[PDB]
Ligand binder design. Structure first.
Ligand SMILES: [Cl-]
Length: 517
């Protein structure tokens, strides 16, 4: 069943409803892509005007399209029931108002995933939030809690939807849900876990009928708390006539620890790692030029531009010796600086770092087509600059766990204006993949050669399946690099700091205590 979801799947939804005697029908069409947990659908009220608010129908109107992480695939009941499908039953209690009772069958009909529903609503107030149409046309993010019902060979599901009301209040809709397979075959019965959801509601400007356009992303989580705050005072330094922002905490003496982020992040990516190190060592975490809270001049934002500014940042702070903690393009900066200043580097901690990627075969299959499209002057700028895909989509797809709205808004803040998105597009176009661009390939080969000969203490973090660093490569490097300790962080893609910050931070702290600094 799970193999039926490896690509984009067309969806059809049909709803027959009756709420307080008002009969109506809704039809929907679109597609789902479980790789991304994604649904893109358009729903039409085929009987006229919808007698209830469109948001009240979102949960009723295909959880088999949820993004289940690799390490949780044995917990995905929904896909395991396919193609024969499952019955989905709910009662939805609208607080201080009526209730919906729904029964749906979700199954494949040919190549199409179909959700057919009957809905009955009763006991609603004619002047309440639902029949009075007092709900805002928007939708919140929720946790959907799933447990097995071993006796009934299905699952029990519970969650509370928060509907924003036009007077600023919130109307709760308490969801009680049961799913049972239609077929007679066995299914996966999961351990307790949850789905983290988000939904975006919009309108079709050319559609005359009452309708709803829906974009939804859902990732499963909860099988094996992470701070969202950024409690660091801003520090600024003039670098090459531009102001760069940096975190600066911990004791003033000793060897400083320099944390370098990559694409599309900022010093925010280090927020839950720095507190493990600050007790014993100075922590300096700059925002790269063009990113975070640093100034954003009109540059090409080639790697060489970042080299120039980071060189000058390090000198501006008068750093002499450093320990480097580096990630993604921050690792290219850190390694390239170490190669040129080996006497000044007392240790390198690194993770998901820039290495020569010899063939596209080594790039994750699920992200291969998108990064190839990023690496163009037309389509790639449309995606990254015009549509902000690297922030809105590639960033969440580089983290195994769900990124919360607060965390997303921290990552979004530097790039609300499309003109400032140049570094987000130039960075993937600098990645050394399949020999191009040759100048980056040559630079990265040089610092990898240096790394293989240098005695500097090394700490390598890696996760499964990773993105830049497959687990087999991390293992090979741990065995071949001198004075290298390797730490498996568990599940992870690219931003390993977001999937296991406590292990990364505590192991850096312990490793620092073993250095002769
Ligand atoms: Cl990149």
């Amino acid at each position: 069943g799970e193999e039926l979801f490896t690509g984009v799947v067309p969806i059809l939804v049909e709803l027959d409803g009756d709420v307080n005697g008002h009969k109506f029908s809704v039809s929907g069409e679109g597609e789902g892509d479980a790789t991304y947990g994604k649904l893109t659908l358009k729903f039409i009220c085929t009987t006229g005007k919808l007698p209830v608010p469109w948001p009240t129908l979102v949960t009723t109107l295909v959880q088999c399209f949820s993004r289940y992480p690799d390490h949780m695939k044995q917990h995905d009941f929904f896909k395991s029931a396919m193609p024969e499908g499952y019955v989905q039953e709910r009662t939805i209690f609208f607080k201080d108002d009526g209730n919906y009772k729904t029964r749906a069958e979700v199954k494949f009909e040919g190549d199409t995933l179909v959700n057919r529903i009957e809905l009955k609503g009763i006991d609603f107030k004619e002047d309440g939030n639902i029949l009075g149409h007092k709900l805002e046309y928007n939708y919140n993010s929720h946790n959907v809690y799933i447990m097995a019902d071993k006796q009934k060979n299905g699952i029990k599901v519970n969650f509370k939807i928060r509907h924003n009301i036009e007077d600023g209040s919130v109307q709760l809709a308490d969801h009680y849900q049961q799913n049972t397979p239609i077929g007679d075959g066995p299914v996966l019965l999961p351990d307790n876990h949850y789905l983290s959801t988000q939904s975006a509601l919009s309108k079709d400007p050319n559609e005359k009928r009452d309708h709803m356009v829906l974009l939804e992303f859902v990732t499963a989580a909860g099988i094996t708390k992470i701070g969202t705050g950024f409690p660091f005072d801003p520090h600024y330094v003039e670098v090459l006539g531009e102001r760069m922002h940096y975190v600066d905490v911990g004791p003033r003496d000793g060897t400083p620890v320099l944390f370098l982020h990559g694409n599309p992040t900022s010093s925010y990516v280090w927020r839950n790692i720095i507190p493990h190190v600050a007790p014993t060592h100075r922590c300096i975490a700059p925002d790269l030029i063009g990113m975070g809270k640093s100034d954003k001049p009109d540059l090409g934002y080639f790697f060489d531009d970042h080299v120039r500014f980071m060189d000058a940042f390090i000198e501006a702070l008068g750093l002499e010796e450093v320990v480097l903690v580096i990630h993604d393009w921050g690792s290219a900066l850190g390694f390239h600086w170490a190669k040129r200043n080996p006497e000044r580097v007392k240790g390198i901690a690194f993770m998901e770092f820039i290495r020569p990627i010899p063939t596209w075969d080594e790039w994750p299959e699920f992200a291969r087509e998108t990064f190839q499209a990023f690496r163009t002057t037309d389509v790639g700028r449309k995606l990254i600059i015009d549509q902000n895909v690297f922030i809105e989509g590639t960033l969440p797809m580089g983290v195994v766990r769900p990124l919360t709205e607060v965390e997303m808004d921290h990552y979004r803040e530097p790039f609300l204006n499309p003109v400032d998105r140049e570094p987000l597009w130039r960075f993937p176009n600098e990645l050394p993949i399949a020999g191009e661009p040759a100048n980056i390939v040559a630079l990265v080969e040089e610092y990898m050669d240096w790394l293989h000969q240098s005695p500097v203490p090394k700490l390598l973090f890696w996760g499964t399946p990773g993105v830049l660093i497959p687990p087999a490569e991390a293992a090979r490097l741990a065995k071949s690099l001198p004075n290298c300790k390797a730490v498996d962080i568990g599940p992870g893609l690219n931003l390993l700091q977001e999937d296991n910050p406590d292990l990364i931070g505590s192991e850096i702290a312990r490793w620092l205590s073993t250095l002769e600094i």
